[PDB]
Amino acid sequence: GIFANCIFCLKVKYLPQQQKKKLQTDIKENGGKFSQSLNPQCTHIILDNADVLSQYQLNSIQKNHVHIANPDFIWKSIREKRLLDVKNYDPYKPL
């Protein structure tokens, strides 16, 4: 699946529960893994709009080369049936 070898930390506390679960099932059904809390094994952290990261979290992210993405990264990669450019979906560095 398109998310093989990807490990996602989900910070999507403010999404409707239905959307959170669809995010999870979309990830799991397409080869992806989950990490409850942020750790060095994470390749990705998904952040909804209302969620923020601390300086400590941002430092860990930089150190461990974690990709910060919004839920659209998942939705649109699924929709296009192809892993998209995660750099186009970074809330902490919009383009």
From Swiss-Prot:
Motif (Nuclear localization signal): 16-22
Subcellular locations according to the entry: Cytoplasm; Nucleus; Cytoplasm, Cytoskeleton, Spindle
Tissues with expression: Widely expressed; the highest levels are in the kidney; also detected in heart, placenta, lung, liver, skeletal muscle, spleen, leukocytes and pancreas.
Top-level taxon: Eukaryota
All copies of domain BRCT, residue ranges: 1-91
Family membership noted in the UniProt record: Belongs to the ARTD/PARP family.
Role noted for this protein: Mono-ADP-ribosyltransferase that mediates mono-ADP-ribosylation of target proteins.
Record note on quaternary structure: Component of the vault ribonucleoprotein particle, at least composed of MVP, PARP4 and one or more vault RNAs (vRNAs). Interacts with TEP1.
Protein name: Protein mono-ADP-ribosyltransferase PARP4
Source species of the chain: Homo sapiens
